[PDB]
Design a protein around this ligand. Structure first.
Ligand SMILES: [Mg+2]
Ligand SMILES: [Mg+2]
Length: 41
RNA sequence: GCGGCGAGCGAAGAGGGAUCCAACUCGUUGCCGAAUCGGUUCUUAUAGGAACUUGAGUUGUGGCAAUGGUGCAGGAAUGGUGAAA
């Protein structure tokens, strides 16, 4: 069951610093990560 | 007021004044969530710039609300000079 779920998380990566900058000249769906963000969610 | 309440000890508020264009920052909360930092390169710059970096960092950086480079000058200040008979 775990291996199934972590493969799901991997399907929704946070955008990399290289791309996040590149997006912002103008976000993709991704897993919330971080105790503070995850606590809100 | 303390104290063999003895010898003794003993302040604070206020008030006059000095000073004072004297205040701010986190954590937290909320809204975001790497926007951060370090290093590399770069612009005449270990810029509060830029590109780049998994390197640190979400076991939480940071933001929001509750400058650096180059140029000229003057000044001031120190010195240097400089009177009468
Ligand atoms: Mg005493
Ligand atoms: Mg913080």
């Amino acid at each position: 069951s775990r291996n199934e779920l972590l493969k799901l998380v991997k399907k929704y990566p946070s955008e990399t610093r290289r791309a996040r900058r590149q997006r912002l000249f103008d976000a993709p769906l991704s897993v919330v990560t971080g105790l503070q963000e995850v606590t809100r969610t």
